[PDB]
Amino acid sequence: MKKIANYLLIEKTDDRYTISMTPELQDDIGTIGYAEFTDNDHLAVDDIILNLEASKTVMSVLSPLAGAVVERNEAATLTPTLLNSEKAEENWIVVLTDVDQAAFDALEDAGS
């Protein structure tokens, strides 16, 4: 199941929630040239996940969900090109567990 929040894609697969870039966010910030993750494994809503420098702005990716970080796309720090891609294996940011079902359900559906 796919949701959108904070211009991020959130996909539920079993107990794991993958948070990725969207084309809308890419278009709004421009080309990413730098990407640095925070080291907090227990996120609250609005906690910083990832700091970006891009051609139109710098910004922070803020978590739309409380949860526990199980995977970060640390490849993007070496190769920020990945986060400008359309490919799901390249443009993901983090995977969370220990997410509240109702809080995910309350997000807007991806597409509309």
Author numbering: 1 to 112
The authors write:
In this study, we report on the identification of a distinct class of sirtuins (SirTMs) found primarily in pathogenic microorganisms and show that these function as protein ADP-ribosyl transferases. Members of this sirtuin class are genetically linked to a specific subclass of macrodomain proteins, which reverse the sirtuin catalyzed ADP-ribosylation. Moreover, we show that in Staphylococcus aureus and Streptococcus pyogenes the sirtuin-mediated ADP-ribosylation is dependent on another posttranslational modification—lipoylation.
To better understand the spatial relationship between ADP-ribosylation and lipoylation attachment sites, we determined the crystal structure of SpyGcvH-L. The structure contains residues 1–110 and is comprised of a barrel-sandwich hybrid formed by two β sheets flanked by short α helices. In comparison with previously solved H-proteins (RMSDs for all Cα atoms ranging from 0.575–1.14 Å), the most striking differences observed in SpyGcvH-L are (1) the position of the β4/β5 loop (residues 38–40), which diverges from the consensus path by ∼6 Å as a consequence of the presence of Arg72 in the β8 strand (a position usually occupied by Val or Ile); and (2) the absence of a C-terminal α helix. Intriguingly, the missing α helix, which is held in place by electrostatic contacts between four conserved residues in the canonical GcvHs, would occlude residues implicated in ADP-ribose attachment in SpyGcvH-L (Glu24 and Asp27). The absence of the steric hindrance imposed by this α helix may be a prerequisite for the GcvH-L/SirTM interaction and thus could account for the high substrate specificity of SirTMs. Mutagenesis showed that the lipoyl-attachment site is Lys56 within the conserved Ex(2)Kx(10)G motif (Fujiwara et al., 1991; Spalding and Prigge, 2009). Only extended exposure revealed slight ADP-ribosylation of E24A, whereas no ADPr incorporation could be detected for D27A. These findings suggest that Asp27 is the likely ADPr attachment side, but further indicates involvement of Glu24 in the ADP-ribosylation mechanism. On the other hand, Glu24 is only present in GcvH-L homologs. Since ADP-ribosylation is a known modification influencing protein function and interactions (Barkauskaite et al., 2013), it is interesting to speculate that the MARylation state of GcvH-L might regulate the availability of the lipoyl moiety for redox reactions. This idea is supported by our finding that the ADPr attachment site is in close structural proximity to the lipoylation site. Strikingly, SirTMs show absolute selectivity for the lipoylated GcvH-L. Altogether, these data show that lipoylated, full-length GcvH-L is required as substrate in the ADP-ribosylation reaction.
